[PDB]
Subunit: 159 residues, 12 copies
């Protein structure tokens, strides 16, 4: 499949791997956010339940932008169940936790991991000579870092 | 209270039966709507604004299902009974306490009443279908989906303490 | 029930007086909201759809003014009293007839009750202002504007026959 | 015509039965949609604007139910039959009078046709459920809820004369 | 975790399994719909690309309704990457197809499987004495059967 | 001087300005009439007729503004003040002592029918002066005025 | 049927002529609206979704132009004739085939029928202007713009094969 | 008879009807004035002043309707026809031969200031008659009229 | 380029004539849209923001009329000619100055070009109607209404100095 | 600074008095707007998201009441004083702590400051009415309604601990 | 063409360099916008409506980026050059063929030009950053994201044939 | 104050550097937001309405950028400093004059302050990038694009005098 897009061939290759790696952990994190959303229980239920839906919409939008960029560079976006299981960097989410603080701890671990993977991806994409992909990761980084603060702010003090 | 003439051909015996089921449910749904605002105004505690605002969503839903149920009484040739006196004589809910304020207090009182109305509407689906009115049973099924979801949102605030 | 501490500095005797005015008005406004839907569902006659739909706009208005009155009770450190039992013990409205159907019969019944509530709210403006609480008086003035317009809409339907 | 292959695993005998029920209902729902606009344009009398406008809301609902019924035929591998000739050969409604103008005369003509289509769709829910197709029965149940309410809105204009 | 919801205990158990089984295949199908959306190529690209986004929104809405019902009945909704991999009934989606007809064939297989699983779930949920859950599956069935027709209509004739 | 590059001939401009300012005065009076009736009608169809007349008033506001703006595009002065309308309207004074809905409908039907018919003539007179753009403004107004006249007459054309 | 009195002063002979033009065009526009949905449900082939959705846009436009044409008949004192029997007796379109599925086959059948209604409406503009009714000719000119654009959209799918 | 359950005393009703119908006539004239200026103004600030005056006209339409509806709630007849407005307005005839923006702003400032000041007095006279609900209608109108008068005067209060 | 076959029955010589009128107008409308943005970006002076924003509304209008004119060419079986090279060979507008900045200088330059295009479109109405195509004439009349209003808006800024 | 001439006829002594009241209140409202965002960004604890989002609603309300107060100063011929230096010189609020994070600590600090501005505005209503300016007293009454409701929303999070 | 004075402190050498980069890109983006509509009007073939409508989304995007690029020229003290003559002298695109109709023909011509502009804007990001203007580089980066996505949407229609 | 723990792995020295840059910028952006409204209320002259309205659009943008900058401080574990006292101690803007009214005098005062804040944020992009924080540099880049356009809109009102 040819493309007129003239980003260098080795920059395309490099950046497609960065993209598809991040895609898998973003899709996993999208699944995790709904898993916590459905099963959380405790005094702050409705506010955290609803917040997690806004995070899921953001993850859906950044995972679509990342996958569409793979394809613009001539690759294959890899977001099926099997590609995500083989490529995700996140540990399996616990399916036997319910308390809000337990889900906040588990989400903070994973949100922090994805936020920091995307932070790295900005630099790696820019250094590869693709500032257009680096801006896709920068936009994702701004939402991931804000979502990470929102979650951490719930546990940084007890009252 | 005159029976009204209509081309709707649901049998007369099914109409009478389901009108009773509807009006009974209507009274407890109106009382539950009043209860929901009573709690909403008077709740106090650390989760005030989120619980306050959630209760207004519930009240809109109870207004919509109470209206669909009352309209169905009239479609079947009956009289919808939703005045203050009808609600007082027919509601199945215990009087709501007017001297509670803590959020957890209101949540326990709301869960009692939401669970009673949720379960009443779950029975009304089966009773309406068995009386031979699946259109009325579908009205109650839509109400049951929102009452079971609302009962879950209330209970999930107290099922764990952290 | 218990009084709540607040930084709001309206004098305590003014708070006590105006909470009584607001809770009294709240019970009749909630009863009038129930009456509005009772008529909405059961009226029948040549202008059915227009009058049926108009009454839904009136019910939304009553819901918004009832909410603003109740919230004001609580801002002044009181307990808003809007449960079925509080409304039944405090409403000034006569029980609404459940055996009427003609539009003109509902209009008469509604005009009587809308008039009573419009005039109650009119007096509440003045009583609130004399107690030194123009903020509460403005809540009642906003409600009075809507109640007097709604009363006019109802009466204009029966003031002429053609 | 011809049967189209689908992965949809509703049994073939149930598909054939329910396609017949859906296309039969589609023809009377399309005729009723044309009837609704025929009456809407030609209404004359004191109740004109509200009845004229209400009939457009009913037309939009009949368009949406008729589209849902037709799409279900095709989902099951059939051919939806909604052309002028299919509707003429399959409708159960008597020709609408083109020489009536008084609103009461259109209301009675509409009540007869709306009653027939409401009651046809009421039976379609049970026939579809008996065939083992609750998905199609739900399409007819949603239609029934709007037909029964529309029938009540029509009849409520003539059940009382004031 | 108690609930006032009085559906019988054995109906709750039965229906939670039906729900969580369907949840896994619906989430897998949601992933598949975006995998095809990103990678399809051919003359009908934009129309099929855009249609698949509407299907994904529908699957997101029915998977949320199914998962929230599990929890209303006192269960645990199971939608993490690992729960979906262990419970999905769909075969791995091919990651090396691009032609629109290849993706339509693969989506038709999977949409047909999920549509037919949900059709069964209506009956099983109703027979268990839970018409409120059966209506959740009925609403999903109407969208799955329409989406299945939309996909099949593209291949039922060649012009 | 209201010098413009618009090349419609100067005599056509002056002819069409007069047609537009005459219609503007009767449209503004009819807009005042519509609210006068709206506020004071009483009877069984009150809310439906009350709300309908507000839709008619918005339409008259939009056509009156399009007619006035066209006068100014053609180099004229739009004449829509209270005194201009009193000296140019063709409508008879609306009665201020009627309340029954049927009495307002008869009074509105007379005045709506006069304005609808003046606008119908204005299409042809503007086209015949060689200004089909102004004729289109009046055609758009005639479609609304004729529809509004039918909605009013439909209420009185049969007794029930 | 009967003619209704109106203050509208279009001359009586022009009213009679244009009512005939309007009711004639109304019948073919309503039949084209039915055809457009018939094709839409039963289309099969690679450009399914785009053509299916486009035909829904065309049906909304035909609904709005048919309503504008009908409403003009009544403004001029006539009776709008849009029932199933009136459409059957007056339509100029040939019966739409119910056994075609391929999208190119629906496109050819739609192009024949849209071309006929576009050319009928083009002629209606000049016949209405000849009768001295530019207001009615504008209704038809608005319809002609949408019909000629919709005919080009259909024909542009078949004028080239790649 | 316009018998109502509204219990404002009959003498207060008649006093406040007169205040409302007097203000209604000057508000309707000012709404006509606002469009008269809007159509015919010419000069460097054309589009901004042209569009602002449409916002003012919508506000006058809404206050005039609230004032008229209050007359009828109190058992009166709202008087807003062309002839009622000509016999009751307090505004001087607007000039039809002015075009410069500064000339329209001066003419509008005179008339906006008169209506703003009549409405200011109407608040107190309605409250003193024992009708704070009608006083609130005039207070809402005064807030818009005083803001509109400031927007007009701000254009002329400094030269640049 | 080549002629396209269509069912549209406007006579072939009329089609040919009106395609020439439409393509000629299209080139000057596209050049005027470019000129409108050139002025929008570069104007400077005391009424900058109001005039800058107004020109964006004019550009959207020119875009919509340019699109309607071009689409009409193609409906009549022609080829719409809107590329940079077609516009350069067919525009009637003089090159816009790139070294002006004062608002009054841009207004003068725009008034000249808006006047030329408004007057071209005015003549196109008549030429289209004389060729027997009132549908195309109505496209030009809609554009003329917007062009004559936009010309007035521009000229009203310079017709007085205060 | 300088006073500007206006046709507004509120007496000159009333204008001077109310301009002082307005500018005084403007300074404390702008400082409260800054405080509300200071707390919002730095809140930490279990009810983070609900309190964070609620404070944004309060900031929009303070922006709209501060703008209405400032605009009234200028309507009366004065100079609105809302710059950083004017706020610093005129605010009645104590400096907000920048080293607090726990949500209960921000709630106590916000309650002190919202209570002060609510009570200042309550007094401003009566001082404006005493000066003979009911139009200005209405601006402050509208602000008082939102300040008293926002103060209750803050205090209701701390009046009970569960 | 005068240089305009501004407080913006980007160095003069960077301003001059980036103004040239912007104006060059502006000319090819305007030509590409014209090309996009040229194709949109004249395309014919089986995927007509989907491709026709997609091209209008592209044209809106090119209008938005062309505007942001031209505005940045002026912010840096330059003259935006977007007239017909400037575009003709500066565009890098070959003249678009006016005698092609097949969708695949238009797609190949569009992909050539979209690829040239996409690649020009990709270079402009780096050239603007290296000239020391990351704010301008961000304008080009936003444009590059939409041009690369649009180039992909065009190429994905021809990268496979089924 | 104190540092909050976060999983955010931007190096600690980069976090400290960039928190200083963000809080310094926040104080001048808040002061500029207050300046913008100070000028907006007190403008007098022929250009009043369009300048008054434009300044509210700039205020909304400064609110949104200032919120984004403050939130980034907290994301990095810092304390956002936006209270009246922090702004007074940290702003780089000279006090805005309260005794100017002519629009040209406010435009020059605004141009000075907007220029200073545009140029401060331009340097913040490069300082943040030098610290290894492109996420924070993008926040300042988005702010820069709106500050530079707002500065050009202000300066374009005074760069020419006609
Ligand atoms: Fe996408
Ligand atoms: Fe209802
Ligand atoms: Fe509330
Ligand atoms: Fe459909
Ligand atoms: Fe959910
Ligand atoms: Fe206008
Ligand atoms: Fe209609
Ligand atoms: Fe009104
Ligand atoms: Fe187009
Ligand atoms: Fe303001
Ligand atoms: Fe722009
Ligand atoms: Fe924020």
């Amino acid at each position: 499949h040819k493309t007129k897009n003239d980003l260098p061939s080795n920059a395309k290759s490099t950046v497609i791997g960065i993209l598809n790696e991040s895609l898998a952990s973003v899709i996993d994190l999208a699944l995790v956010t709904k898993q916590a959303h459905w099963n959380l229980k405790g005094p702050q239920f409705i506010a955290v339940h609803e917040l997690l839906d806004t995070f899921r919409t953001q993850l859906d939008n950044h995972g679509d932008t990342i996958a569409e960029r793979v394809v613009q560079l001539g690759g294959t976006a890899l977001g099926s169940l099997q590609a995500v299981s083989s490529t995700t960097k996140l540990k399996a989410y616990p399916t036997d936790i319910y308390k809000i603080h337990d889900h906040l701890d588990a989400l903070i671990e994973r949100y922090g991991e994805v936020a920091n993977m995307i932070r790295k991806a900005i630099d790696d994409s820019d250094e590869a000579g693709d500032p257009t992909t680096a801006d896709i990761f920068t936009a994702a980084s701004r939402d991931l870092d804000k979502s990470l603060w929102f979650l951490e702010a719930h546990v940084q003090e007890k009252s």
